[PDB]
Amino acid sequence: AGAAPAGGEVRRVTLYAERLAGGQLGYGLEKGKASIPGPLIELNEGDTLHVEFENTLDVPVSLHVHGLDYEISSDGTKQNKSHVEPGGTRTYTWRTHEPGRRADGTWRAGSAGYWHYHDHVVGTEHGTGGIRNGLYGPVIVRRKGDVLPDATHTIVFNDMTINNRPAHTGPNFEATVGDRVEIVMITHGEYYHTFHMHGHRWADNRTGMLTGPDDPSQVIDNKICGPADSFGFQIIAGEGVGAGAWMYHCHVQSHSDMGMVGLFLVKKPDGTIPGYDPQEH
């Protein structure tokens, strides 16, 4: 898909918090297309995003971002009078920025990386009940020259669920051998977990690729993660291992048993998966 360009476009989008089946809550880019996870927000460093947000719930909701620049007005908390009342609208405003030398000669970390947004005022003032119900979603902020993927898949460990799904309902994601798949992995709630993928590995750093033969970042297939931790990577599907149904799961042993498990379906060029007996789950 090429590579990211340099940023600096004032983007704007519409966001709504809606009720979902089963008492669940979610964000969507249009009324009635709310999902869990929320819609993937993607940005290039420099970009500015106005988020026009409406609350269709009977309770106040908010919209709070990790890792992006925001004045306190866009804090998204009761503490800075920045929530959205029932039936209310409010425009939030996020900025990103590039790395660069400061006047004291110290490097200013840019805004790039794998981030998230969630609610901060439902249930409690730290968003506990809203986060549990599914008011969360991913934010990617690229830097110029970042390799771009063929696909992007978000995997939130929210307590003992994957993306609030029922135990052992995945989700599963598909690809084809060689694809540049990207994974965003976020964690929410009470518990710590350990994210693990069969047959694939990545570098523990911003992009999940090594920069080169002098990138000392370690190569893992298992990452521990806690509430609100976010990381991402990109892998080449089946690189060095082939097609097949490739397990991902939480490696905390009671958590894969209770069903924090899903499948990375990496397919041959003809769309088949060898040995994928769908009844092996």
Among 36, 43, 184, 245, binds its own copies (CB under 8 A): 245
250 known ligand binder = yes
CB of 56 to Cu ion, least distance (A): 22
CA distance between the termini of the chain: 33
From the list 22-30, 35-43, 83-91, 242-250, the region that binds its own copies by CB under 8 A is 242-250
196 known ligand binder = yes
Q: Find tokens 């990790």 and name the residue.
A: 66
CB of 196 to ligand O, least distance (A): 6
State the pairing for strand pair 64-65/48-55.
Answer: unpaired
**x-marked contacts with Cu ion along 221-250 as a string, rule CB under 5 A:** -------x---------------------x
Q: Residue 132's Cα: distance from chain center in Å? A: 15
Among 20, 59, 177, 241, binds its own copies (CB under 8 A): 241
> How many Cβ atoms from other residues are within 10 Å of residue 226's Cβ?
13
CA distance 17 to 61: 8
Residues 49-78 contacting ligand O, CB under 6 A:
64
Q: Does 196 bind ligand O (CB under 6 A)?
A: yes
CB of 60 to its own copies, least distance (A): 14
**x-marked contacts with Cu ion along 179-198 as a string, rule CB under 5 A:** --------------x-----
Q: Does 221 bind its own copies (CB under 8 A)?
A: yes
Q: Does 110 bind its own copies (CB under 8 A)?
A: yes
Q: How distant, in Å, are the alpha carbons of 64, 83, 123 from that of 80?
A: 12, 8, 17
* 189 φ/ψ angles, rounded to the nearest 5 degrees: 130, -130
CA distance 245 to 170: 12
Q: Find tokens 């966001």 and name the residue.
A: 15
Binding residues for Cu(2+): 64, 66, 118, 120, 193, 196, 198, 249-251, 255
